[PDB]
Amino acid sequence: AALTRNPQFQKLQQWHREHGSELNLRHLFDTDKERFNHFSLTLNTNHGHILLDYSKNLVTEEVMHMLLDLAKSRGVEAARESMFNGEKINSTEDRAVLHVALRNRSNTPIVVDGKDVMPEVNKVLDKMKAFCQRVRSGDWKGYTGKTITDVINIGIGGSDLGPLMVTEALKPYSSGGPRVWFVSNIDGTHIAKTLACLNPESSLFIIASKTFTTQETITNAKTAKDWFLLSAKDPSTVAKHFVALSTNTAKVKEFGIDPQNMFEFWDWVGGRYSLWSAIGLSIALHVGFDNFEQLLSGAHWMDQHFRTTPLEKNAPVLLAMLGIWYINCFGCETQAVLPYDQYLHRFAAYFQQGDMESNGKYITKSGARVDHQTGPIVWGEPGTNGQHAFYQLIHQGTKMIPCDFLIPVQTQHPIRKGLHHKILLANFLAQTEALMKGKSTEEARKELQAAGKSPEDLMKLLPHKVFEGNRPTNSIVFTKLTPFILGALIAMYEHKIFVQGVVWDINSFDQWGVELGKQLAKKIEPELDGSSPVTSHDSSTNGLINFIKQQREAKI
Amino acid sequence: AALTRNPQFQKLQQWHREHGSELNLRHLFDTDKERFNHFSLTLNTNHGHILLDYSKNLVTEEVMHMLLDLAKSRGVEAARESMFNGEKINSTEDRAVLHVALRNRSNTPIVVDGKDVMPEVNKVLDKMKAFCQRVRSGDWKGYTGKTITDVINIGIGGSDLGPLMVTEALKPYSSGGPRVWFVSNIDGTHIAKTLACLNPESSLFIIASKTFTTQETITNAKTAKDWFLLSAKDPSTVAKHFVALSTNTAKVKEFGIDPQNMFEFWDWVGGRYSLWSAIGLSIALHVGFDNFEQLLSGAHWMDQHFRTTPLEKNAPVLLAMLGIWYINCFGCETQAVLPYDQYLHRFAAYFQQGDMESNGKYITKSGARVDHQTGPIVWGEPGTNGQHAFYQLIHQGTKMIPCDFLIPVQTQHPIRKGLHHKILLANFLAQTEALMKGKSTEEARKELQAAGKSPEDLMKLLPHKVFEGNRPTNSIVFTKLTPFILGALIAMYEHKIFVQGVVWDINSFDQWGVELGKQLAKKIEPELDGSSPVTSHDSSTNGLINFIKQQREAKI
Ligand SMILES: O=P(O)(O)OC[C@@H](O)[C@@H](O)[C@H](O)[C@@H](O)CO
Ligand SMILES: O=P(O)(O)OC[C@@H](O)[C@@H](O)[C@H](O)[C@@H](O)CO
């Protein structure tokens, strides 16, 4: 309700109704040689540069002004401070939101109802490093005196995506580290296929679960233990092959893991923002603690940029408001994330959760139902592959789709004297250029006539060759995808999401939308047993269950 | 535009504007005990059953009737026959569309240009089987007399995603076959990390490219060949380690591969519909030819169901029209594909290309520009993971998102005596029930009161715990995910895509939208070499390029 009442918002929307359709990227660049200079920012982190070019967006200096005025009147700055200061901004759960403390390497005090949290944060960090050291050095032996060769993280959602995405992204920095595996789905196939290729002797399992009660995780963990025990037959050895990352000690101990091997994080760490805490143990074990600290450092650098930079040149804010523009004014349902980097193949999926689970809300902080759009659908696949799969729709479809193109200037594998990367870069550049420029009917007609096409054949194919263009994109280029830079990029989007949540006046840090499904699932599980028909639900659920019971023992 | 002029379409549209928002799933089920029976389709393939339950959709008998009348008035059946009969329906390229011929196990003649295509189709299948047997049995030897332990498919888009998705989906049926790898991205990382795990002596590369001129594929191919010859040495050994799947004989020879080592397909085989042709060699090598023929047989079965079934009971037609309903009447931008199966982890991605590249068009067969929506943005991740990642938005966001839930009754890994699959099934069922049913304010309040919440805690939380529900879903349940069933499922969606294209009167089989990007990339490629700044493009393209040249030398 708040947003739609805001005068800055109304002014912005009225302007859009009057001039929105007028805006044409090709025309804007053709009439302003300083567009790139005026609509981009270069960030020097001292550990590489980050160029955020947002010039190929449907905005003018006037549009940007109104967007910033809106961010201001919506209290983005005061909201940011409240988060960094440990205030309980996660209202529905009455909790603080402090993933920024997890990477607060300046160690500036951050008190939550009485005490500074940093001491506990750094205590867990030290414990992690000391542990990674023992594991990666062979010091930590299995139940038969052998060294650890494989680490298996068992968790789902926030306790899975972050570590997986990061270890994939930083694979080049895993030299000398154990092989890391990730089991998340309850689908038996996941754990089964993973355990098939593992020696219980040199295998270390990490049970990652904030609540340590999640059905998928606990079930997978128990199955892993059975698998392990079948070989090491002796319960007392699980303490050598099972560690836990949780906030609850009782359940961990109950599972059979000693509190000494429990790396804890806190309630003001949201799952989808937990890879920076003990949840990132698998990351540290894979790339070493030095690199993990660089990861955290990169995020801290971005945290500072977000906190001290004027809105007009604040990356997270600029990305967020541009998003608001397309979402609330142009009505675009989605946001595409297209990294031209094979190592970042799980990047889009990570923010699919980070963004959608955070802002996929419809009730404001005041308890009022929104009367405007909130979080968008995030999606995408790494660069050069997408061009041969779905760019067709982005270029000539009937949907407006804001796209974020990302790529590192320097590749981790400069094979063929850099030939591959040069081509990758050319495509990265050419695609955003094409989306902006397009190709007019006249340009396409000349091409066809030069191809000796008959008037009949020229007319029949002509329109299909036209690219209307005027499709907006953001180009984010960084020196190299290192642990530090990656950390800065993730934090950057974390804050983009934070800013949009504030503007929409929703709680980006809770997730009550998962309860109903969990409840109905618990009531169905017992009903699946046996061959008796179920009639307790709607005819559809009843029909599906009965189909399942009937086909349960059908021989193919 | 044909669709907007259609009277059945206008009637549908008018009805929606007048009663659309009145449809409430919970109400529909509560007042119609026959809903499931009236809106579900059960297919017995004699090799497993497939249940398409579309009752949880915002439709009534009357709506389904209007939808079917539209499919009829748009000439869906006549278009289908034209495709199956080899007519050149790919109008912009003047080519036939015959992926159906590739799996025509009945061998009924399909004539193109006065000649039956089946003889050539089967000749290639026999060649494929013969080659597979040699490699699989160990008969085929490397340049050092060693058998083949690894098969590397080098290709992109249509020559990649299909075999990749299917080999992943059918892992259970790959016992014996050599390890299969897929290289696609030009990003040097992709081929570098793959080659690092191979021995040139026992590696067999498959260059998959219809044209055999695609830059990414040819460049990757050349890099692999150099890598190989690095150890081998003489150009003569290449014939034992490289084969090609293409239509370009001249180029294949030019590359260094001699015919007979080239498995061909034809121009009427669209890349995104080519896994059923020679492009599926990697699938055959991985799971054996018997399983591959099962895959083809499954699709053929579906082809037959599509061709002989009355529209009202035609699976792909119903799927198609329900989509039209949500796209052109409700205005939904996306389509979620959520398979509750880890093996199908790339299923959604496969149809992201198959659907979006096919129907992401804006020009009709008559040359008119569409004045209505076309293809939707396809996306998703396997279940139950999604439930912890983005379902928050599907349940409580501000977007209507049609969802296709898929799951096999029987699992390939019934570990823990079926415990994992029992839970997976329970969630599959509960999620759609939840999306449909929701949870009212009063229902939520009663729960909060029972939970012992205080008046002030109950009041701040209440709103956030309400699920408005009324979110549509399709539940597709099949006995087991076998080669045959997977084939039927893929074909089912291919035809869904076909039907929608017909209704929108667009050409679902060309892809002119990729041309602009490719040509602009060829222009930038040589401009990256120099150290001199570039000024020949828009200021953004210029700025990005210059940043790259500056940061290229940056030491980190
Ligand atoms: O097992 P855990 O650690 O309690 O996580 C259980 C998952 O449902 C949860 O992490 C979910 O991804 C979100 O809340 C993250 O913000
Ligand atoms: O190298 P190929 O086989 O010519 O494929 C080149 C790819 O651009 C192409 O397959 C693309 O995915 C689509 O047209 C498929 O319909």
Short mmCIF file of all heavy atoms in Angstrom, two decimals, chain A residues 53 56 187 193 223 342-343 362 369 383-384 388 398-399 410 416 420 433 466 468 479 515 540 551, chain B residues 53 56 185-187 193 216 223 342-343 362 369 373 375 416 420 422 465-466 468 479 537 540 551 554:
data_model
loop_
_atom_site.label_atom_id
_atom_site.label_comp_id
_atom_site.label_asym_id
_atom_site.label_seq_id
_atom_site.Cartn_x
_atom_site.Cartn_y
_atom_site.Cartn_z
N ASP A 53 28.08 -1.06 -16.57
CA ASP A 53 27.60 -0.22 -17.66
C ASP A 53 26.09 -0.39 -17.77
O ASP A 53 25.62 -1.43 -18.22
CB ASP A 53 28.26 -0.63 -18.98
CG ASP A 53 27.82 0.22 -20.15
OD1 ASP A 53 26.94 1.08 -19.95
OD2 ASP A 53 28.36 0.03 -21.26
N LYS A 56 22.80 1.01 -21.66
CA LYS A 56 21.88 0.44 -22.64
C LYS A 56 20.53 0.16 -22.00
O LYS A 56 19.86 -0.80 -22.35
CB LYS A 56 22.42 -0.86 -23.24
CG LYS A 56 23.71 -0.73 -24.05
CD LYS A 56 23.98 -2.03 -24.80
CE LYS A 56 25.34 -2.05 -25.47
NZ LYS A 56 26.44 -2.37 -24.50
N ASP A 187 15.03 -36.90 -3.37
CA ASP A 187 15.00 -37.95 -4.39
C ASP A 187 16.20 -38.88 -4.17
O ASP A 187 17.35 -38.47 -4.34
CB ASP A 187 15.07 -37.30 -5.79
CG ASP A 187 15.04 -38.33 -6.92
OD1 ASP A 187 14.98 -39.54 -6.64
OD2 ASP A 187 15.07 -37.90 -8.09
N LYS A 193 23.45 -42.05 -6.16
CA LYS A 193 24.46 -41.91 -7.20
C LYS A 193 25.74 -41.27 -6.66
O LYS A 193 26.82 -41.48 -7.21
CB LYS A 193 23.91 -41.08 -8.36
CG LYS A 193 22.60 -41.60 -8.94
CD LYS A 193 22.81 -42.82 -9.83
CE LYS A 193 23.81 -42.53 -10.95
NZ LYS A 193 24.07 -43.74 -11.79
N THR A 223 20.52 -41.71 5.91
CA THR A 223 20.82 -42.69 4.87
C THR A 223 22.32 -42.77 4.68
O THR A 223 22.87 -43.85 4.43
CB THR A 223 20.16 -42.30 3.54
OG1 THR A 223 18.74 -42.39 3.68
CG2 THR A 223 20.62 -43.24 2.42
N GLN A 342 31.72 -20.30 -17.91
CA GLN A 342 31.29 -21.66 -17.62
C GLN A 342 31.34 -21.97 -16.11
O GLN A 342 30.50 -22.70 -15.59
CB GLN A 342 32.17 -22.65 -18.39
CG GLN A 342 31.59 -23.13 -19.71
CD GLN A 342 30.17 -23.65 -19.57
OE1 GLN A 342 29.26 -23.20 -20.27
NE2 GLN A 342 29.97 -24.60 -18.66
N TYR A 343 32.31 -21.40 -15.41
CA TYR A 343 32.41 -21.64 -13.97
C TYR A 343 31.20 -21.09 -13.21
O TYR A 343 30.87 -21.59 -12.13
CB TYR A 343 33.69 -21.02 -13.42
CG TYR A 343 34.92 -21.85 -13.69
CD1 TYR A 343 36.06 -21.29 -14.25
CD2 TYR A 343 34.94 -23.22 -13.38
CE1 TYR A 343 37.19 -22.05 -14.50
CE2 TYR A 343 36.07 -23.99 -13.62
CZ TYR A 343 37.19 -23.40 -14.18
OH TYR A 343 38.32 -24.15 -14.43
N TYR A 362 3.81 -10.64 -0.97
CA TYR A 362 2.67 -9.82 -1.34
C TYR A 362 2.06 -9.05 -0.16
O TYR A 362 1.11 -8.30 -0.33
CB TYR A 362 1.60 -10.68 -2.04
CG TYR A 362 0.75 -11.53 -1.12
CD1 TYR A 362 -0.61 -11.26 -0.97
CD2 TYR A 362 1.28 -12.60 -0.41
CE1 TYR A 362 -1.42 -12.02 -0.13
CE2 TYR A 362 0.49 -13.37 0.45
CZ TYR A 362 -0.86 -13.07 0.58
OH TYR A 362 -1.66 -13.79 1.44
N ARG A 369 -1.91 -5.72 1.96
CA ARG A 369 -1.66 -6.45 0.73
C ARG A 369 -1.17 -5.47 -0.33
O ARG A 369 -1.77 -4.41 -0.52
CB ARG A 369 -2.94 -7.13 0.24
CG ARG A 369 -2.70 -8.11 -0.90
CD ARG A 369 -3.99 -8.61 -1.51
NE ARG A 369 -3.73 -9.70 -2.46
CZ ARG A 369 -2.91 -9.61 -3.50
NH1 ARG A 369 -2.25 -8.48 -3.74
NH2 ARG A 369 -2.73 -10.66 -4.29
N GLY A 383 26.80 -17.80 -20.79
CA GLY A 383 27.04 -17.16 -22.11
C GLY A 383 27.73 -18.05 -23.16
O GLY A 383 28.64 -18.84 -22.83
N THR A 384 27.21 -17.79 -24.36
CA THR A 384 27.54 -18.38 -25.67
C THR A 384 26.62 -19.58 -25.97
O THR A 384 26.35 -19.91 -27.13
CB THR A 384 29.02 -18.79 -25.78
OG1 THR A 384 29.18 -20.15 -25.43
CG2 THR A 384 29.94 -17.96 -24.89
N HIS A 388 22.31 -19.87 -28.59
CA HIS A 388 21.85 -20.94 -29.47
C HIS A 388 20.64 -21.65 -28.88
O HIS A 388 20.22 -22.69 -29.39
CB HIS A 388 22.97 -21.96 -29.69
CG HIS A 388 24.25 -21.34 -30.16
ND1 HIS A 388 24.71 -21.48 -31.45
CD2 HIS A 388 25.16 -20.58 -29.51
CE1 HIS A 388 25.86 -20.83 -31.57
NE2 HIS A 388 26.15 -20.27 -30.41
N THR A 398 7.81 -11.65 -27.97
CA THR A 398 6.83 -10.62 -27.64
C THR A 398 6.94 -10.19 -26.18
O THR A 398 6.02 -9.60 -25.63
CB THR A 398 5.39 -11.10 -27.90
OG1 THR A 398 5.14 -12.29 -27.14
CG2 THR A 398 5.19 -11.39 -29.38
N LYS A 399 8.08 -10.50 -25.56
CA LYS A 399 8.31 -10.16 -24.16
C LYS A 399 9.50 -9.21 -23.97
O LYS A 399 10.54 -9.36 -24.62
CB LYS A 399 8.59 -11.43 -23.34
CG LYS A 399 7.37 -12.20 -22.85
CD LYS A 399 6.74 -13.09 -23.90
CE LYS A 399 5.63 -13.94 -23.27
NZ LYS A 399 4.88 -14.77 -24.24
N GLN A 410 39.76 -11.31 -17.82
CA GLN A 410 40.80 -12.33 -17.83
C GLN A 410 40.24 -13.72 -17.54
O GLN A 410 39.53 -13.92 -16.55
CB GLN A 410 41.87 -11.98 -16.79
CG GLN A 410 42.74 -10.79 -17.17
CD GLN A 410 43.63 -10.34 -16.02
OE1 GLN A 410 44.09 -11.15 -15.22
NE2 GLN A 410 43.90 -9.04 -15.96
N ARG A 416 44.99 -21.67 -26.44
CA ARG A 416 45.10 -21.22 -27.83
C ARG A 416 45.50 -19.74 -27.87
O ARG A 416 45.03 -18.99 -28.72
CB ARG A 416 43.77 -21.40 -28.56
CG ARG A 416 43.30 -22.84 -28.67
CD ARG A 416 44.03 -23.61 -29.77
NE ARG A 416 43.08 -24.16 -30.74
CZ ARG A 416 42.55 -23.48 -31.76
NH1 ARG A 416 42.89 -22.22 -31.96
NH2 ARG A 416 41.67 -24.07 -32.55
N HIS A 420 39.92 -18.53 -27.61
CA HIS A 420 38.58 -18.82 -27.10
C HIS A 420 37.98 -17.65 -26.34
O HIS A 420 36.83 -17.28 -26.57
CB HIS A 420 38.60 -20.06 -26.19
CG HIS A 420 38.63 -21.36 -26.93
ND1 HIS A 420 37.67 -22.33 -26.78
CD2 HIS A 420 39.50 -21.83 -27.86
CE1 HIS A 420 37.95 -23.35 -27.58
NE2 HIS A 420 39.05 -23.07 -28.25
N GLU A 433 24.94 -5.23 -27.98
CA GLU A 433 24.91 -4.25 -29.06
C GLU A 433 23.71 -4.54 -29.97
O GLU A 433 22.98 -3.63 -30.35
CB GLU A 433 26.20 -4.29 -29.88
CG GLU A 433 26.15 -3.43 -31.14
CD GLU A 433 27.48 -3.34 -31.88
OE1 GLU A 433 28.16 -4.38 -32.00
OE2 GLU A 433 27.83 -2.24 -32.35
N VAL A 466 13.77 -8.64 -39.68
CA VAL A 466 13.80 -7.40 -38.93
C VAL A 466 13.98 -7.61 -37.43
O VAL A 466 13.33 -8.46 -36.83
CB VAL A 466 12.51 -6.58 -39.17
CG1 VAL A 466 12.54 -5.31 -38.33
CG2 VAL A 466 12.37 -6.24 -40.64
N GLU A 468 13.57 -5.45 -34.18
CA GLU A 468 13.09 -4.19 -33.64
C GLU A 468 14.02 -3.60 -32.59
O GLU A 468 14.03 -2.39 -32.35
CB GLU A 468 11.67 -4.38 -33.08
CG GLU A 468 10.72 -4.95 -34.13
CD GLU A 468 9.26 -4.93 -33.69
OE1 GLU A 468 8.96 -5.33 -32.55
OE2 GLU A 468 8.42 -4.52 -34.51
N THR A 479 37.71 -7.53 -13.90
CA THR A 479 39.05 -7.94 -14.29
C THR A 479 39.25 -9.45 -14.35
O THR A 479 39.81 -9.97 -15.32
CB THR A 479 40.10 -7.34 -13.34
OG1 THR A 479 39.96 -5.92 -13.31
CG2 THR A 479 41.51 -7.70 -13.81
N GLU A 515 5.45 -23.03 4.41
CA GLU A 515 4.70 -23.83 5.38
C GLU A 515 3.56 -24.69 4.86
O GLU A 515 3.50 -25.88 5.17
CB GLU A 515 4.18 -22.93 6.50
CG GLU A 515 5.28 -22.20 7.24
CD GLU A 515 4.86 -21.75 8.63
OE1 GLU A 515 3.84 -21.04 8.75
OE2 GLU A 515 5.55 -22.11 9.60
N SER A 540 -8.71 -34.27 -7.52
CA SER A 540 -7.43 -34.32 -8.23
C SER A 540 -6.36 -35.02 -7.39
O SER A 540 -5.73 -35.98 -7.85
CB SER A 540 -6.95 -32.92 -8.60
OG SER A 540 -5.66 -32.97 -9.18
N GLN A 551 -0.18 -47.94 -9.93
CA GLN A 551 1.02 -48.15 -10.73
C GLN A 551 2.27 -48.51 -9.93
O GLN A 551 3.31 -48.84 -10.51
CB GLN A 551 1.28 -46.90 -11.57
CG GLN A 551 0.24 -46.67 -12.65
CD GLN A 551 0.20 -47.80 -13.66
OE1 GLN A 551 1.23 -48.14 -14.25
NE2 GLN A 551 -0.97 -48.38 -13.87
N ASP B 53 -3.07 -35.02 -15.59
CA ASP B 53 -4.15 -34.46 -14.79
C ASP B 53 -4.08 -32.95 -14.95
O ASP B 53 -3.19 -32.30 -14.42
CB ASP B 53 -3.96 -34.84 -13.32
CG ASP B 53 -5.03 -34.23 -12.42
OD1 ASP B 53 -5.94 -33.56 -12.93
OD2 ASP B 53 -4.95 -34.43 -11.19
N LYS B 56 -6.50 -29.17 -12.20
CA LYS B 56 -6.17 -28.03 -11.35
C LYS B 56 -5.87 -26.79 -12.18
O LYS B 56 -5.01 -25.99 -11.82
CB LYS B 56 -4.98 -28.33 -10.44
CG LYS B 56 -5.23 -29.37 -9.35
CD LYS B 56 -4.14 -29.30 -8.28
CE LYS B 56 -4.13 -30.52 -7.37
NZ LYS B 56 -3.55 -31.72 -8.06
N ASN B 185 30.38 -24.79 -24.79
CA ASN B 185 30.73 -23.38 -24.74
C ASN B 185 32.05 -23.09 -25.43
O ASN B 185 32.96 -23.92 -25.44
CB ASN B 185 30.81 -22.92 -23.28
CG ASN B 185 30.45 -21.45 -23.12
OD1 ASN B 185 30.75 -20.61 -23.98
ND2 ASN B 185 29.82 -21.13 -22.00
N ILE B 186 32.16 -21.90 -26.01
CA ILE B 186 33.39 -21.48 -26.66
C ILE B 186 34.35 -21.15 -25.52
O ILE B 186 35.57 -21.25 -25.66
CB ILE B 186 33.18 -20.22 -27.53
CG1 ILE B 186 34.52 -19.77 -28.14
CG2 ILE B 186 32.58 -19.10 -26.69
CD1 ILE B 186 35.22 -20.83 -28.95
N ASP B 187 33.78 -20.75 -24.38
CA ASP B 187 34.55 -20.42 -23.19
C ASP B 187 35.59 -21.52 -22.99
O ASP B 187 35.26 -22.65 -22.66
CB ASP B 187 33.62 -20.35 -21.97
CG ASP B 187 34.35 -20.07 -20.68
OD1 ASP B 187 35.59 -19.90 -20.72
OD2 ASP B 187 33.69 -20.02 -19.62
N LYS B 193 38.99 -28.04 -19.09
CA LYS B 193 38.76 -28.94 -17.97
C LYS B 193 38.37 -30.35 -18.40
O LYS B 193 38.54 -31.30 -17.64
CB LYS B 193 37.71 -28.35 -17.02
CG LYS B 193 38.10 -27.05 -16.32
CD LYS B 193 39.14 -27.24 -15.23
CE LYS B 193 38.59 -26.77 -13.89
NZ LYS B 193 39.65 -26.16 -13.01
N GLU B 216 31.79 -21.79 -32.45
CA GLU B 216 32.12 -22.44 -31.19
C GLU B 216 32.52 -23.90 -31.38
O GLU B 216 33.56 -24.34 -30.88
CB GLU B 216 30.93 -22.39 -30.21
CG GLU B 216 30.57 -20.99 -29.70
CD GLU B 216 29.39 -20.38 -30.43
OE1 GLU B 216 29.22 -20.65 -31.64
OE2 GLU B 216 28.63 -19.61 -29.80
N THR B 223 40.66 -27.26 -31.43
CA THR B 223 41.47 -27.27 -30.21
C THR B 223 41.68 -28.69 -29.72
O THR B 223 42.76 -29.04 -29.24
CB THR B 223 40.80 -26.44 -29.10
OG1 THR B 223 40.84 -25.05 -29.46
CG2 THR B 223 41.52 -26.64 -27.77
N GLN B 342 15.76 -36.19 -10.06
CA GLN B 342 17.11 -35.67 -10.18
C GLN B 342 17.70 -35.96 -11.56
O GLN B 342 18.47 -35.17 -12.10
CB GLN B 342 18.00 -36.29 -9.10
CG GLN B 342 19.36 -35.64 -8.93
CD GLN B 342 19.24 -34.16 -8.60
OE1 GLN B 342 18.27 -33.72 -7.99
NE2 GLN B 342 20.25 -33.39 -9.01
N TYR B 343 17.33 -37.11 -12.13
CA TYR B 343 17.84 -37.47 -13.45
C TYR B 343 17.38 -36.49 -14.53
O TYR B 343 18.07 -36.30 -15.53
CB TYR B 343 17.41 -38.90 -13.81
CG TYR B 343 18.29 -39.97 -13.19
CD1 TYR B 343 17.75 -41.12 -12.63
CD2 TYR B 343 19.68 -39.82 -13.16
CE1 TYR B 343 18.56 -42.10 -12.06
CE2 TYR B 343 20.50 -40.79 -12.59
CZ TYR B 343 19.93 -41.93 -12.04
OH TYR B 343 20.74 -42.91 -11.50
N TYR B 362 7.63 -13.05 -33.70
CA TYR B 362 6.67 -11.95 -33.73
C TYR B 362 6.11 -11.65 -35.13
O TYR B 362 5.42 -10.64 -35.32
CB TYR B 362 7.29 -10.68 -33.13
CG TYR B 362 8.22 -9.93 -34.05
CD1 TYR B 362 7.86 -8.67 -34.54
CD2 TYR B 362 9.46 -10.45 -34.41
CE1 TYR B 362 8.72 -7.96 -35.37
CE2 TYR B 362 10.32 -9.74 -35.24
CZ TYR B 362 9.94 -8.50 -35.72
OH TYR B 362 10.78 -7.80 -36.56
N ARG B 369 2.71 -8.68 -38.50
CA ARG B 369 3.34 -8.64 -37.19
C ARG B 369 2.27 -9.04 -36.19
O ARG B 369 1.15 -8.52 -36.24
CB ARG B 369 3.84 -7.23 -36.86
CG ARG B 369 4.70 -7.18 -35.60
CD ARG B 369 4.94 -5.76 -35.12
NE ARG B 369 5.85 -5.70 -33.97
CZ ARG B 369 5.66 -6.34 -32.82
NH1 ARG B 369 4.59 -7.11 -32.65
NH2 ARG B 369 6.54 -6.21 -31.84
N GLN B 373 0.47 -12.04 -27.72
CA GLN B 373 1.63 -12.73 -27.17
C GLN B 373 1.91 -14.05 -27.88
O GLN B 373 0.99 -14.69 -28.40
CB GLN B 373 1.44 -13.01 -25.68
CG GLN B 373 1.60 -11.80 -24.78
CD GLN B 373 3.00 -11.24 -24.83
OE1 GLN B 373 3.98 -11.99 -24.75
NE2 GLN B 373 3.12 -9.92 -24.94
N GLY B 375 5.27 -17.30 -27.79
CA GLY B 375 5.97 -18.15 -26.84
C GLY B 375 6.30 -17.56 -25.48
O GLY B 375 6.70 -16.40 -25.39
N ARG B 416 16.32 -47.40 1.14
CA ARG B 416 15.57 -47.27 2.39
C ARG B 416 14.17 -47.84 2.22
O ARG B 416 13.20 -47.34 2.80
CB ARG B 416 15.46 -45.79 2.79
CG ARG B 416 16.79 -45.07 3.06
CD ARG B 416 17.45 -45.54 4.36
NE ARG B 416 16.62 -45.30 5.55
CZ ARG B 416 16.47 -44.13 6.16
NH1 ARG B 416 17.10 -43.05 5.71
NH2 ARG B 416 15.70 -44.03 7.23
N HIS B 420 12.69 -42.63 0.56
CA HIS B 420 12.99 -41.39 -0.13
C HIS B 420 11.94 -41.05 -1.18
O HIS B 420 11.46 -39.91 -1.25
CB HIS B 420 14.36 -41.46 -0.80
CG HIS B 420 15.51 -41.25 0.14
ND1 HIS B 420 15.79 -42.10 1.18
CD2 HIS B 420 16.45 -40.28 0.19
CE1 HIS B 420 16.85 -41.67 1.83
NE2 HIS B 420 17.28 -40.57 1.25
N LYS B 422 8.90 -42.14 -1.32
CA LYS B 422 7.61 -41.92 -0.68
C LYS B 422 7.48 -40.44 -0.33
O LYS B 422 6.46 -39.80 -0.60
CB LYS B 422 7.50 -42.76 0.59
CG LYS B 422 6.24 -42.52 1.41
CD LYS B 422 6.28 -43.32 2.70
CE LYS B 422 5.07 -43.05 3.56
NZ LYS B 422 5.11 -43.87 4.81
N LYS B 465 0.80 -15.33 6.79
CA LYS B 465 0.54 -16.78 6.78
C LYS B 465 -0.61 -17.19 5.87
O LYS B 465 -0.95 -18.37 5.78
CB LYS B 465 0.27 -17.29 8.20
CG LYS B 465 1.51 -17.43 9.07
CD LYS B 465 1.15 -17.98 10.44
CE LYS B 465 2.38 -18.23 11.30
NZ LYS B 465 3.26 -19.29 10.74
N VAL B 466 -1.22 -16.22 5.20
CA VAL B 466 -2.34 -16.50 4.30
C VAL B 466 -1.88 -16.83 2.88
O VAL B 466 -1.04 -16.14 2.31
CB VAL B 466 -3.30 -15.29 4.25
CG1 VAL B 466 -4.30 -15.47 3.12
CG2 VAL B 466 -4.04 -15.17 5.57
N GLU B 468 -3.39 -17.25 -0.81
CA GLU B 468 -4.57 -17.00 -1.62
C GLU B 468 -4.88 -18.16 -2.56
O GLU B 468 -6.00 -18.27 -3.07
CB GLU B 468 -4.39 -15.70 -2.41
CG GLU B 468 -4.13 -14.50 -1.51
CD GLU B 468 -4.16 -13.19 -2.26
OE1 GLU B 468 -3.70 -13.15 -3.41
OE2 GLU B 468 -4.63 -12.18 -1.68
N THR B 479 4.39 -44.17 -14.94
CA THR B 479 4.84 -45.36 -14.22
C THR B 479 6.32 -45.38 -13.87
O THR B 479 6.68 -45.64 -12.72
CB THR B 479 4.50 -46.63 -15.01
OG1 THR B 479 3.10 -46.65 -15.30
CG2 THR B 479 4.85 -47.86 -14.20
N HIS B 537 31.73 2.03 -32.74
CA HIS B 537 30.41 1.59 -32.30
C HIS B 537 29.72 2.66 -31.47
O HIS B 537 30.16 3.81 -31.43
CB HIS B 537 30.54 0.32 -31.46
CG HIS B 537 31.18 -0.83 -32.17
ND1 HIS B 537 30.46 -1.71 -32.96
CD2 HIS B 537 32.46 -1.25 -32.21
CE1 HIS B 537 31.28 -2.62 -33.45
NE2 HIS B 537 32.50 -2.37 -33.01
N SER B 540 28.64 2.86 -25.68
CA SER B 540 28.65 1.76 -24.71
C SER B 540 29.56 0.63 -25.21
O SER B 540 30.46 0.18 -24.50
CB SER B 540 27.24 1.22 -24.49
OG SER B 540 27.29 0.01 -23.75
N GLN B 551 42.06 -3.47 -18.90
CA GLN B 551 42.13 -4.48 -17.86
C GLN B 551 42.76 -5.80 -18.29
O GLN B 551 43.06 -6.65 -17.46
CB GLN B 551 40.73 -4.73 -17.30
CG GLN B 551 40.21 -3.53 -16.54
CD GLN B 551 41.07 -3.23 -15.33
OE1 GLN B 551 41.48 -2.10 -15.10
NE2 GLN B 551 41.33 -4.26 -14.53
N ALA B 554 46.08 -5.71 -16.80
CA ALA B 554 46.06 -5.57 -15.35
C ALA B 554 46.51 -6.83 -14.61
O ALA B 554 46.01 -7.92 -14.85
CB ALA B 554 44.67 -5.17 -14.88
#
